Amino acid sequence: MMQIFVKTLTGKTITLEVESSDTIDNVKAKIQDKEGIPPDQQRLIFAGKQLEDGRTLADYNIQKESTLHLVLRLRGG
């Protein structure tokens, strides 16, 4: 179980609790509850690097309360 701080585009950094062997897909599902933006255009960028969509939290060697900044891609409107 890994606790992480994900920083939405709204600037709000929420504490998201997921499994260590879980996937970024579930992280997006927590984020979409806050941002309301589907996982299709929301991407995760940690330390200035994009993380593969769906990777395990422990894969990038994340620790408790690490900061994950997300970037939204332009959605057609």
Swiss-Prot record:
It is found in: Cytoplasm; Nucleus. Residues 2-77 form the Ubiquitin-like domain. It comes from the Eukaryota. There is a cross-link at G77 (Glycyl lysine isopeptide (Gly-Lys) (interchain with K-? in acceptor proteins)). There is a cross-link at K49, K64 (Glycyl lysine isopeptide (Lys-Gly) (interchain with G-Cter in ubiquitin)). Exists either covalently attached to another protein, or free (unanchored). When covalently bound, it is conjugated to target proteins via an isopeptide bond either as a monomer (monoubiquitin), a polymer linked via different Lys residues of the ubiquitin (polyubiquitin chains) or a linear polymer linked via the initiator Met of the ubiquitin (linear polyubiquitin chains). This is Ubiquitin. It comes from Oryza sativa subsp. japonica (Rice). The gene is Ub-CEP52-1. The chain holds residues 1 to 76 of 129 of the full protein.
